[PDB]
Amino acid sequence: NLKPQTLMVAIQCVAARTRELDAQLQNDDPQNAAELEQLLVGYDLAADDLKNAYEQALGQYSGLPPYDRLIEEPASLEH
Amino acid sequence: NLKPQTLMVAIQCVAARTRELDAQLQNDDPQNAAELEQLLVGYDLAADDLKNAYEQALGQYSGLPPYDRLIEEPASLEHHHHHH
């Protein structure tokens, strides 16, 4: 089974792609947006499975950050 | 301990972010190139691990696709022509 560093990278990358697609929905053709919206529910299901695995890892290894810090949106994009 | 569908999503999301960073490094005046490259090392190590995990998740007679199809570059599949 996967290394904890791999879980961190996967969690980070899935969160980033979800935010990047959400941002485009408003100016997208509704026809195209409606199709993305269904794909994005699949991303969220994968995100939950990943969180469950990471929580198990937190009980087994030392030196790992809290889950909520991994999925935080970077400040440079907020302010 | 991840479902096949979860592994497929992770693989494609990591590949997509990798393409985005590759594009930034190939452009004019990349900022903090040494650090972008440090990030890419990490992404590739995760990609290798996810690939081994996907392989192990396949049944002996699975209906799931080859790993190489998941990470193929979208632009490489396109063709473009104006009307004559």
UniProtKB/Swiss-Prot annotation, chain B:
- Give the UniProt keywords, A-Z: Disulfide bond
Origin organism of this chain? Pseudomonas aeruginosa (strain ATCC 15692 / DSM 22644 / CIP 104116 / JCM 14847 / LMG 12228 / 1C / PRS 101 / PAO1)
Name a Pfam family for this protein. T6SS_Tsi2-like
Is Glycoprotein included in the keywords of this UniProt record? Answer: no
Protein's UniProt name: Immune protein Tsi2
Its job:
Immunity protein that plays a role in preventing early activation of toxin Tse2. Binds to a large surface of Tse2 and thereby occludes the active site to specifically inhibits Tse2.
Task: Provide the phenotype resulting from gene inactivation.
Answer: Deletion of Tsi2 is lethal in the presence of Tse2.
How it assembles, according to the record, is: Forms a heterotetramer with Tse2 consisting of two Tse2 dimers and two Tsi2 dimers. Formation of the complex inactivates Tse2 enzymatic activity.
Q: Which InterPro entries match?
A: T6SS_Tsi2-like, Toxin_immunity_effector, Tsi2
Q: Does the keyword section mention Disulfide bond?
A: yes
